[PDB]
Write a protein that binds this ligand. Sequence first.
Ligand SMILES: Nc1ncnc2c1ncn2[C@@H]1O[C@H](COP(=O)(O)OP(=O)(O)OP(=O)(O)O)[C@@H](O)[C@H]1O
Ligand SMILES: Nc1nc2c(ncn2[C@@H]2O[C@H](COP(=O)(O)OP(=O)(O)O)[C@@H](O)[C@H]2O)c(=O)[nH]1
Ligand SMILES: [Mg+2]
Length: 349
Amino acid sequence: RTNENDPAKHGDQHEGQHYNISPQDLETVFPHGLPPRFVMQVKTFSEACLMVRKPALELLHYLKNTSFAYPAIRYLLYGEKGTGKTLSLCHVIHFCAKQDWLILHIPDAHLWVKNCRDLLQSSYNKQRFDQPLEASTWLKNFKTTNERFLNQIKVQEKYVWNKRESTEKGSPLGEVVEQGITRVRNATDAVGIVLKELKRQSSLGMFHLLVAVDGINALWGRTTLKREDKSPIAPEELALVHNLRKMMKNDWHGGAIVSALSQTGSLFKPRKAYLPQELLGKEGFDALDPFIPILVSNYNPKEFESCIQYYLENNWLQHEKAPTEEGKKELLFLSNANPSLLERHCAYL
RNA sequence: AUGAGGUGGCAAGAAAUGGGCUACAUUUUCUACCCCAGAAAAACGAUAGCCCUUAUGAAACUUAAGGGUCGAAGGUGGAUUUAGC
Ligand SMILES: Nc1ncnc2c1ncn2[C@@H]1O[C@H](COP(=O)(O)OP(=O)(O)OP(=O)(O)O)[C@@H](O)[C@H]1O
Ligand SMILES: Nc1nc2c(ncn2[C@@H]2O[C@H](COP(=O)(O)OP(=O)(O)O)[C@@H](O)[C@H]2O)c(=O)[nH]1
Ligand SMILES: [Mg+2]
């Protein structure tokens, strides 16, 4: 536990201690993305406490040393399953949001590339496919996270939604987002327009952009979605995926592209694929490189004690032997300091 | 000719019954995977029927296999009753 709640002052001195996110900030900045199990824990406890760690502090120092004049640099948080990459990305997202950044956050790319009942054909490009439901979902999440910047940011082009309906240069980005949401048919197109406008305006310096993409390995992998002829679909055929790759490019400046690999839900990948190349594949490695790889691993004994004491204080560990050092040692044995295994045991312990 | 040889052919269903397989689903449907996920959920449910193609073969309505098609009965079951330490 730390008294410091501002995400710009805390550093290594706070290592091994929880950092609280207020409910209002959780709602605004993080209406999505956060792991389902941590969401259940937050619902149970009324406390969104993430222990600060070297990975998150490192990437915060990276973003403080970043020069927006530089073309946006890529960072890649990689590791095994349940090492907390998602929560580190969320922590840094909170930092940038409190720093007034525009957070272009992708909660998970695995969802975008599977189980898409609504798969129409993009009007803007008849050779691609749209995912109106997911487009609307992410548009709503982005609006929730950056409503303030939504109005402040204007468009710089004419965008035709129908033969008679269009949006005009200089209009606020709110008009585009509203069109995408209400007119779900235009959802993917609005997502692409938003990505383009945010990229160009970050280049112009209207704000500072953090492109925080979770499970980035999905983009350059494979897809299970099948055409009306049952043919397989490659990722580029998904306008969302192609636009997200365009964003993953570093050609633009005015921000940084942070990403976090995630095997959870990955397609055709064996359970043990956790290395950057093994996940991204040749195409993904080639697209991301250059990148700064940051490892996320199990807990150390200090952070293990911090997590256990957090659960004990919250009384989550309602069993009698949980405070006992023997129970602590058994938890360490079973979870090998793995955050996800530890929590998935503590849930019924 | 109650012996021998050659060509062609039914191998069906009022009705009952024995055994087996598949189900009626949510402990399920589906993918990935081979067990830390996302969808389906009145859809589940035919190895049956119809058409086409492929393998075998001299010969495929005859057999088997693959695709499409159709999505039927049924929603845990009567008399009763089988097997297992
Ligand atoms: N810094 C942290 N503060 C609090 N809890 C944490 C922290 N890091 C990890 N945990 C706990 O670890 C659990 C497991 O993390 P989780 O699996 O969601 O992360 P991940 O790195 O995205 O992994 P996965 O590959 O499983 O998606 C989280 O639910 C959370 O309870
Ligand atoms: N409906 C619509 N969509 C647009 C328009 N302009 C841009 N977009 C969307 O914004 C995305 C980015 O556009 P852009 O990169 O310039 O097109 P591309 O380079 O040819 O792929 C596209 O995928 C479109 O879906 C427009 O005028 N109308
Ligand atoms: Mg994570």
